[PDB]
């Protein structure tokens, strides 16, 4: 058995527990779920106008999942340098999950146009490749929200759990079973603008950042051990 204990040979006196930092810092940390709701960068993109897009056109689509994206490293100096952050490092330790996610997408300053955001629980996830942000229409019956840039250029979201499942896969997904692609993402969030073709040209190569966190609904399943890890200071310095 793993967690058995054959013969304790303790030398120690009993330590005063700090109560996981509650005694010093005035706050507990034993519950890792209350750390999980600290926001983490999900994926940062650069806007790129390909066609003279209609107002209906989504500017980018991305699947929505707590696993962390297919990591997209001119590299992005965070994903080149600060690997993975927190939440997929915890999410490596659990085979399944079930629960909500929060997003809080942040938009740049020079944009002014109105923003529509969709949840699409119809969309499956086909393989771990193309499970990243994709620069590409608006739809009716999908769950929708418009944030106005002029009031405040940061939308916030509580994207719920819409799966016909008991829980969903949390490790990186190879798409073995064909219906199992229905059971990885919560759905698919799409961000699109109402900007016309003349004004969206100014917004090219502006960053759009998306954050994420779980938001109290998430409850992880059966334990799985960690994968092999990379130690970050061993990464090379940029020789100049």
């Amino acid at each position: 058995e793993e967690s058995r204990n054959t013969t304790v040979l303790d030398t120690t006196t009993t330590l005063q527990s700090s109560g996981f930092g509650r005694a010093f810092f005035g706050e507990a940390f034993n519950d890792l779920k209350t750390l999980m709701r600290r926001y983490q960068l999900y994926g940062q993109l650069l806007l790129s106008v390909t066609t003279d897009k209609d107002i209906d056109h989504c500017m980018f689509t991305f699947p929505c999942l707590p696993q962390g994206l297919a990591l997209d490293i001119s590299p992005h100096e965070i994903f080149n340098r600060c690997r993975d952050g927190i939440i997929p490092l915890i999410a490596s330790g659990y085979r399944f999950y079930r629960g909500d996610l929060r997003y809080k997408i942040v938009f740049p300053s020079n944009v002014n146009s109105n923003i529509w955001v969709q949840h699409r629980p119809d969309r499956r996830l086909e393989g771990w490749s193309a499970a990243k942000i994709v620069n590409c229409v608006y739809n009716h019956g999908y769950a929708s929200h418009i944030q106005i840039t002029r009031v405040n250029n940061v939308i916030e979201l509580e994207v719920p759990f819409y799966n016909a499942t008991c829980y969903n896969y949390l490790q990186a997904f190879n798409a073995s079973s064909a219906a199992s692609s229905y059971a990885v993402s919560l759905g698919e969030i799409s961000v699109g603008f109402q900007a016309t073709s003349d004004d969206i040209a100014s917004i090219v190569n502006k960053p759009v950042t998306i954050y994420y966190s779980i938001g109290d609904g998430m409850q992880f399943s059966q334990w799985v051990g960690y994968q092999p890890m990379m130690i970050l200071d061993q990464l090379p310095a940029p020789v100049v």
Binding site: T6, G21, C82, Q227, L232
Partner: protein, 205 residues
Amino acid sequence: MTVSSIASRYGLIRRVQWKKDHAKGSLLLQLDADPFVEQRIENPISLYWFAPVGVVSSMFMQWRGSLEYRFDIIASQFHTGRLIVGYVPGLTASLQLQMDYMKLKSSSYVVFDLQESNSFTFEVPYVSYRPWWVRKYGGNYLPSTDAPSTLFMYVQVPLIPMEAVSDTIDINVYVRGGSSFEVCVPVQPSLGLNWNTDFILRNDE
């Protein structure tokens, strides 16, 4: 889901060969008494196993408390052995040498007899000046500290096997966070996954 739910899981972290002809002072491991235990897998970056208490320590700034390392000494009841699991608080890198069992037994130590029972979980104490202890590795940042203390394992009496069994014996070393283990400050994690081991340099030429 709980830090102590992770820290109460053994993770296999060291294979130590233990032969017949190892002498009565030979070192078996000098590995550090943090949860950050170095286990190297044989890419231009390298990947490492860790204990679960090692990783869930690596998602925090500071840790404290005991570290129960389990020595599972795989042998028959015909093998007879004896080995110290010692523990010295506060040995720097220059003091990583000069170590042997005779200078070990001054500090806290546990002598074990390998016999009809073959397994024991030593509880590594937390002995440090500081209430907590900073993460050994940190972010990708060359400053920011080695271990608080060091474990040692010397062969006090060498293996005297019977001539029907083998000269060599595996010793497996598990690591589990102790009952008083606790971590506090949530910072940038020092470990990344191996889902995407690709790395991009940023030379300027």
